[PDB]
Amino acid sequence: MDEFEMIKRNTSEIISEEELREVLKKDEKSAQIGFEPSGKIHLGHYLQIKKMIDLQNAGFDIIILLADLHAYLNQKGELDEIRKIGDYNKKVFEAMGLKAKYVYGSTFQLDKDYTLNVYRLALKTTLKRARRSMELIAREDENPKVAEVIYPIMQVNAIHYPGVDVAVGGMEQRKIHMLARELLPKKVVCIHNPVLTGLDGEGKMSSSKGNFIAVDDSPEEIRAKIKKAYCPAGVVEGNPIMEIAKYFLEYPLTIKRPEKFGGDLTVNSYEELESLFKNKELHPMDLKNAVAEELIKILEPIRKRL
Amino acid sequence: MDEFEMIKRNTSEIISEEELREVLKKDEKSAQIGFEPSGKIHLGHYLQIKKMIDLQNAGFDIIILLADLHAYLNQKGELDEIRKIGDYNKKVFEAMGLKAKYVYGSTFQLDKDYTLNVYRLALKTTLKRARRSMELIAREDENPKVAEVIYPIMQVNAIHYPGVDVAVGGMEQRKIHMLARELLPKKVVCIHNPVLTGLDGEGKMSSSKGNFIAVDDSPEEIRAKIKKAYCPAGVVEGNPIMEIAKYFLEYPLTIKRPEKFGGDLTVNSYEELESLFKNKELHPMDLKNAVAEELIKILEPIRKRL
Ligand SMILES: [K+]
């Protein structure tokens, strides 16, 4: 209960909890998040779309900004082709239960007045504050190009443009997001989501790699990908399987196993589960077994309506 | 005649003379130079609106580009405001005897397509290669802004846009130009010009703060300005007066002179005068005089034509 808490839940931070308190009181409020069209939609996207839904059920008008432009320039399909990848992402998000408005930056991000403000913003954005923004995202070409410093003021003006009250994004975007706070006349509330550690235990669950779990993958694809997944003893920090637990599973969870090698349990909460894994009583295999079967029932409704 | 040698005249360099030649062969050849609307139009502009004329006389269809947008951005005027300023310059350049095509950057540099290529280009411009470009133009900025490194590519696509065969301009522009040459399908021929020094020897005569002889200056003002001008005997390098001698006076000119101070002289080459001034024969005073009077005769045609 408490719209505040529901939005707050599982977030990594809310730039000004105070400002959100106020936004909520408004009878008309908007929140926007951006997604570049992805071939496969993984738990990483789902984690966030899930958060968008939160704001959805709280009076917020959701806007899912589709970054097809970046794909255009960055040598990838043609816009028409991208539209097709992106309109699939819509079918998925709708599957997740996201009643939002979808836009393609490729319809406003080049228009006259937009470019103008962008340039305008460029006058008040230090080469440094900009670079450090993009620092969180990717590592930084051998020899960096001008486009890299432009990206952040592009994303900035994309928050300004709609005039929304809230911006959602993973923690990679806090720098850019903070630039927006300091540069736009309208300070926007930012809700950042934790990043999701890939299966092999490296970076994010980027589909630009192969350590992800698609919201559509078959019950087999899941069981497989999980049994391989990185998941040490006692260690919870960095543990992919443990995140999947903290952010997607419903409780009270009841994990099984022969009273010979353990004993069936019932972790009414996650902290509860975490503490076990820390105390060692819950072997990595039992966890995977539990998460797998569970994760499967959860992502089930989505695969279905697809 | 050899128009190549005509144009070659008073040019700090012609990036690819051979290419220039290949150009002169064509029937349809065009070139453009760029100017930011200015209140006072001093000899600075003159040195080049002249060269521009040489190329129009070789056949090159002239194109002037009043970068009213840059001017806008730098919190100067308000487009339509600036507009009238540039349109005044248009008149001054016309009162200088230049047939040409006049265009405002604000009318294209903000178009989807144009902006689109700026970004494509942004992926091809290293952060430094971009910075080292502006450095020759206007020093550096304590806390550089993305605007700085965006301008160069903003100028590159400015050569591309019309598809000019040659890009005229000052030497501060050399490094910007190379870029346009290294990043565009064709390799425009760049005829860079000397950079006229201010009457105090501190730099370029800048309409933007001080030292300069504005074309419409009255004989009397010209005399008062040329007199105060830094011009040390024997010193030719740096001396603005001498530059004015070199780039504007027709030879042979008869430097009027006190019978008892050496007596009237008649130089048939700038080299004589140089030789003279260097050897301390032509004292600065007699020099400043022969020059001021001579300028007043050349500018009058333009001055009164207004
Ligand atoms: K509360």
Curated annotation (Swiss-Prot), chains A, B:
Residue ranges annotated as motif 'HIGH' region:
37-45
The short motif 'KMSKS' region is annotated over 204-208
Q: What is its EC number?
A: 6.1.1.1
Q: Which reaction does it catalyse?
A: tRNA(Tyr) + L-tyrosine + ATP = L-tyrosyl-tRNA(Tyr) + AMP + diphosphate + H(+)
**Signal peptide location in the record?**
none
Q: Which GO terms describe its cellular component?
A: cytoplasm
Protein name (Swiss-Prot/TrEMBL): Tyrosine--tRNA ligase
Whose protein is this, by species?
A: Methanocaldococcus jannaschii (strain ATCC 43067 / DSM 2661 / JAL-1 / JCM 10045 / NBRC 100440)
